[PDB]
Amino acid sequence: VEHVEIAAFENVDGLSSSTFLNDVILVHQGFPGISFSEINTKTKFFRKEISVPVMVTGMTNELGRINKIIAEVAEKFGIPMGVGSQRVAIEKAEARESFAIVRKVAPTIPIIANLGMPQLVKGYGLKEFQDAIQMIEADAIAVHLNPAQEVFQPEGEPEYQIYALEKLRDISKELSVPIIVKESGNGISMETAKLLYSYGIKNFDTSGQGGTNWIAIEMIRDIRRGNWKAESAKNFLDWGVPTAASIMEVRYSVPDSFLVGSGGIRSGLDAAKAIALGADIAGMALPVLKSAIEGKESLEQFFRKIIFELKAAMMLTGSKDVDALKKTSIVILGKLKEWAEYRGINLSIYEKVRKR
Amino acid sequence: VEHVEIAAFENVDGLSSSTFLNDVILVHQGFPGISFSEINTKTKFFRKEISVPVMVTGMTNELGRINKIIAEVAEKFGIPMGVGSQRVAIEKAEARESFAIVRKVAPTIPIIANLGMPQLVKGYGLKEFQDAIQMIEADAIAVHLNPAQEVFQPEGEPEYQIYALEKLRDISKELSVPIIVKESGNGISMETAKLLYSYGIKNFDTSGQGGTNWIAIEMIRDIRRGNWKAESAKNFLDWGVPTAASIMEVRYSVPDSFLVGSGGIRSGLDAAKAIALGADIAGMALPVLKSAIEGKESLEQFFRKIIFELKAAMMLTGSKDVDALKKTSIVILGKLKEWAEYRGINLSIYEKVRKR
Amino acid sequence: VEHVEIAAFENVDGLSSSTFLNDVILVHQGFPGISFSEINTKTKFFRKEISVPVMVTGMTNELGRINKIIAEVAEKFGIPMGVGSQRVAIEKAEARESFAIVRKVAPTIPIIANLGMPQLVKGYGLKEFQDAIQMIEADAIAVHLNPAQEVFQPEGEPEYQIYALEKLRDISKELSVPIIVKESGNGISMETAKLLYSYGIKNFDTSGQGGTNWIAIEMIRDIRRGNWKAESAKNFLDWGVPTAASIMEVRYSVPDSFLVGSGGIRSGLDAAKAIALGADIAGMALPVLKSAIEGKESLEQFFRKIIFELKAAMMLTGSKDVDALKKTSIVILGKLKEWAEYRGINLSIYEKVRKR
Amino acid sequence: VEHVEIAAFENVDGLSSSTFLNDVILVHQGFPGISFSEINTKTKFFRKEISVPVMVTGMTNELGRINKIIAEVAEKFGIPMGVGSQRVAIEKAEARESFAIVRKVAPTIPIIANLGMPQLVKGYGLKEFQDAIQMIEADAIAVHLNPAQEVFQPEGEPEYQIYALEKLRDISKELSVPIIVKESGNGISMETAKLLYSYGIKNFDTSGQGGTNWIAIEMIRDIRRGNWKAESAKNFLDWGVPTAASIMEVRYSVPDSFLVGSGGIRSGLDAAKAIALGADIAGMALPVLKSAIEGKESLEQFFRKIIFELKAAMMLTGSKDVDALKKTSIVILGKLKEWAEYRGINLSIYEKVRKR
Numbered sequence A, B, C, D: 001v002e003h004v005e006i007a008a009f010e011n012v013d014g015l016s017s018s019t020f021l022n023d024v025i026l027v028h029q030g031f032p033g034i035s036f037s038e039i040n041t042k043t044k045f046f047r048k049e050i051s052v053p054v055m056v057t058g059m060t061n062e063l064g065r066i067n068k069i070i071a072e073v074a075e076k077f078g079i080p081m082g083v084g085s086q087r088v089a090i091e092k093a094e095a096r097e098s099f100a101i102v103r104k105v106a107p108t109i110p111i112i113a114n115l116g117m118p119q120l121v122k123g124y125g126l127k128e129f130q131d132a133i134q135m136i137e138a139d140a141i142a143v144h145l146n147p148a149q150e151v152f153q154p155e156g157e158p159e160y161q162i163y164a165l166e167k168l169r170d171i172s173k174e175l176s177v178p179i180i181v182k183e184s185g186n187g188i189s190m191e192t193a194k195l196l197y198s199y200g201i202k203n204f205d206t207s208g209q210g211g212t213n214w215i216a217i218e219m220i221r222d223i224r225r226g227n228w229k230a231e232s233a234k235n236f237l238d239w240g241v242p243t244a245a246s247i248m249e250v251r252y253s254v255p256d257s258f259l260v261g262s263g264g265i266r267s268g269l270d271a272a273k274a275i276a277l278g279a280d281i282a283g284m285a286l287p288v289l290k291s292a293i294e295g296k297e298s299l300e301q302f303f304r305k306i307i308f309e310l311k312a313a314m315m316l317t318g319s320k321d322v323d324a325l326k327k328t329s330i331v332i333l334g335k336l337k338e339w340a341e342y343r344g345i346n347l348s349i350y351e352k353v354r355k356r
């Protein structure tokens, strides 16, 4: 598919965009108070325990073999996996297999189902959610927001009438698993998290700018068909809430949330920063795709590296476990500091909130 | 004409200058609450409704055909258009046509007459103003300030005594249509807006630095004649109030103003930022000229793009209409923030005023 | 002489240093409320009136012809002129003419004698000071501080003991003309100004970093002799109080001072900024020397250029005279803002002070 | 030895790291109030007086000759010298000489022993400490922290259980000399300083980032071995507390500490800055190694240069002695300013603490 081709092989990772993660420093503790072998990376993911506080977030036959590779490696490492949109599989019986195998190959890890928010204004509802969940015996379902991508694509247009949320709220009352609302690379602001929260959504995946740039992907699609919209997309390459800013806004405005910090997480250090900032876990998509494309051992080496990097940051902050990481001392500098200040985030009360 | 030749084909657009608009961020809303097709870009321009909150601002035989192109396309898109200085048409009856074509080809949109503050200093009075208006059946008249251009031009030297403002006030009480006071690239400060406001001026067009650089144009003219003033002009290339700062200072110092945010507006995103910051409409001149020179179809495509970009910023901020855009969430960072703080602009109270 | 050779023809103007004047913005006024021909640049210099608020500051047969040129042009333009150090003329009768000529060629302007603070640590006293004054019928005497130069020069080491100030205080009591204390490229701090003030010094010339870099001059002298001190000098190239910061410190700590704002003043805009910030007049040395070396007509053109640029800044700020310019609206940003804040300069009470 | 090979000949000094000392400005005093020849650089180092407030910090048969050169030059200049880790000398009776020579060739200066904190959880205790000290007749012992280096090295893992401090605390009551706790290039934070202080540690050596980058050194070791941990070390090159930030944090959090400011000290201006910021003395390692390798006269010239540079900064700040330097006027700007602010270092109570 053209989207996968562009994302994996063109220069669109963080193109003219920023996570603001470089504005976050984890304070080095020269006397850690622990040994490396005592570091415990285990944490809760709803009703299950996972081995490392990171998930693979959703990415849409050839698509099913990447999904297979990702799922088996995720299972091995005890990390949760989101699948990409299950709309095609809801509609076409054939496509059901390229999702199913996930649970054949990953019996124990949390698996998160996926449908787009715009589908809720287009006839999708309780049944479809139940089908997407059943299809992979999912432990949760992610509902994704991608208005920026939809705005810049040749075809169709974004529809996010409030009805979607009213329906989602109804759905949440009969679903057997939790709902996560996630972005797709442009981030969740406090106004959006408060709005979602007001309809009963308590679980968020920031998916901020700085990682996969979908506006850049549509720019490329546009250039490829000589569409003038490409020039317009260029103006919006840096559009969105940066991941680090998104983590703060969501944690601040809904302190009881379960929070995935994703969008440009490219190292275990990035993952450690996201968690220390306020996330409960870090999410990754694009670098998982690129490694899985190289093959199973490449993705295994990828996760070994991400996990080493995470434990390195844990060790060097004297953080024996994830709960300790979430309260370790940080510095916030530069644009992220200015962002937080303008946005009314009292850093003093932020600190308190991130640490509880 | 030399000035048009230099503006169109030399490197004078934003030369060593800045709008400060890069310090303005529109907060992305992942659940916009609207569909793209419900976005309404209509707004008021004095007694008329326009289709988009953007105007072409004034730009001075061959200058009549560019005006004709601009005017038929502005009519098509339902956007207001200011003409360039009518001085030559007051002084020569034969220059009237290159303005009279405007109303034949654009019978319904607001059309804004144009005379200089220099003409008012020099004994233009009511009749000249009435004649400029009648010549194009104008819906208002813009009076331009260009002391910087006058300072640096090979020939002549500016006069801006308060007697001209006494004249303007006298004229305004007998005119059939409102007066807009606009700059020409170097922007309107709070002192200047307040002074004008004390003389009954309520409508402003910021025309701040960052776009067409008239000091740069005169520097080039000076270079061309081997005039030593070109070195002095170079020291002044970054002179003036940046467009974003000017929007802020005028809205802050005259809360009730009708305000055009102009000077370096080059995209529908720039336009959306200017309006969200505090302008009622965005103005553009130079890129409209450059597209009109290419032709009617080039300029039609230019406007479709501006409009698409505007609506994309409204969609992605959850702004269903121009009133909502005016109150959407922003971040102010960097030098603009330092500018505002130094100039006594409480950013807390600024938010209140811009949202009303 | 080697110092003039290096200053005039090597890369030492602003080398790795900064005036901080780029952090000072004069607020553009689109309706100035004055005309260009009514602008009055006349100001006071002790008991004389000068035509422009700028002086040539001191610069050390061939040295007497550059002085002669500078003096005749300064007389022509009505601007005060400091001579360079008169030590050699106190020490040798023959060296007197290369100064004396000054007063033959420049009978009316203020002329400022020059002796070093190192001469006061070394046994110059009243008579030597009187002789320096009489030799050129000076209207004031400058005593220069150059400890950085002395530190890094190949030969010898600085002495700035307190008895030299006791001596200056005593001398000042029997002198017929005022004493100005000036630096030589490294700027005057509030601690230094307050100390000088406690001994009766009322008149200061900032000579801050960002213009002529004397540490760079000595570095080059050191390099030219294979002297290892060159590498040490390199580490101190950005040593000193930037001119803009020095102006603020002296104005704030000695509000009643007469203040020359100098050190890196390279245009009439620089000069206008220095005065707006708090100086009574601006000072220049190096670019005058460079022009003088090309000849009298070149220097005449240089002054015409400086004056035009000063009047342009006055015009475009609506400042009818120097007193108006001193209270015109400014913006302070960036490092200078941070400098001022850290040094306890409340930017609100600073405004009050500079405006009186 | 590989670590010396890499430190001395690869690009690892300040690689992707920063001391933050460029954010510290010493205020120039154009009238110093002292002479160069009167400047007194003597200061206390526990029970001894040293000639200059700088030490050589510890660096680990050809390792002995470098040590012998360093020690004899340090003796000549009256500067204290730390040795590298004595672990091998404890285990191997042959290695004792390459440390003991130090004391034959430097009978009078303070000599500082060295063992690593992780040894305390691996069998080392009072006896090994007494041994280390006796072997070189030490005046103090340094216990080093190098967790970041141990994390990234091919072989092994960092062990810093609290037991190590419990043991160290016991040892401290029976040792005949003081204990200094030092980092090794990644700096000491307030949490770590306060933790050490709670176990009785009063003496600290910041060894902050910006100088020798041990994560970089291990990265190169990993590269050379084809180890994938190299890619992970690259992610951590800028990890740690910058030297200037560490000096502020330790002085702030343990105001009566004896404090060595080290990590990236490369000139006497860096040393002066470190001292004025709040250190008692400055420490250097890498540049001493590099000079020692070139030979005795090179190292002699190096110290001459450092000392001249320190006295230059003392002269130019009007600091007659080390006590005066510690209270001289400074400006803190930029990232260091932001770091201190985030970390709750009230810059006003900081000023008091560092000046007492």
Ligand SMILES: Cc1cc2nc3c(=O)[nH]c(=O)nc-3n(C[C@H](O)[C@H](O)[C@H](O)COP(=O)(O)O)c2cc1C
Binding pocket: A003, A004, A007, A057, A058, A059, A060, A083, A084, A085, A114, A142, A143, A144, A182, A183, A184, A185, A207, A208, A210, A211, A212, A262, A263, A264, A265, A283, A284, A285, A286, A287, A289
């Ligand atoms: C090829 C590709 C396909 C994607 N498809 C989906 C999708 O079907 N569902 C969805 O929720 N997110 C989708 N995502 C968005 C990711 O889940 C993630 O939110 C975003 O890429 C930011 O993370 P990253 O920077 O680690 O890639 C897709 C991303 C990629 C790269």
Ligand SMILES: Cc1cc2nc3c(=O)[nH]c(=O)nc-3n(C[C@H](O)[C@H](O)[C@H](O)COP(=O)(O)O)c2cc1C
Binding pocket: B003, B004, B007, B057, B058, B059, B060, B083, B084, B085, B086, B114, B142, B143, B144, B182, B183, B184, B185, B207, B208, B210, B211, B212, B262, B263, B264, B265, B283, B284, B285, B286, B287, B289
């Ligand atoms: C070629 C040209 C001619 C102009 N002539 C006029 C004029 O006659 N009247 C006037 O009010 N403004 C004049 N303008 C100023 C514009 O109206 C506008 O204020 C300024 O160029 C800043 O907007 P921009 O950056 O979008 O060009 C002129 C601008 C251009 C480029």
Ligand SMILES: Cc1cc2nc3c(=O)[nH]c(=O)nc-3n(C[C@H](O)[C@H](O)[C@H](O)COP(=O)(O)O)c2cc1C
Binding pocket: C003, C004, C007, C057, C058, C059, C060, C083, C084, C085, C114, C142, C143, C144, C182, C183, C184, C185, C207, C208, C210, C211, C212, C262, C263, C264, C265, C283, C284, C285, C286, C287, C289
């Ligand atoms: C070649 C040269 C020689 C100087 N000699 C003197 C001196 O004799 N007396 C003194 O007070 N200042 C001396 N100055 C310092 C200047 O008066 C002035 O303070 C300094 O150069 C900063 O101004 P500028 O950046 O405009 O050069 C000298 C400067 C130059 C360039």
Ligand SMILES: Cc1cc2nc3c(=O)[nH]c(=O)nc-3n(C[C@H](O)[C@H](O)[C@H](O)COP(=O)(O)O)c2cc1C
Binding pocket: D003, D004, D007, D057, D058, D059, D060, D083, D084, D085, D114, D142, D143, D144, D182, D183, D184, D185, D207, D208, D210, D211, D212, D262, D263, D264, D265, D283, D284, D285, D286, D287, D289
């Ligand atoms: C080659 C080398 C070996 C080192 N070995 C030791 C060691 O044995 N003990 C120790 O405490 N620190 C050791 N250090 C760290 C230094 O003492 C110092 O803390 C660090 O290098 C930062 O200072 P610098 O940037 O001036 O080198 C070593 C440094 C170098 C360059």
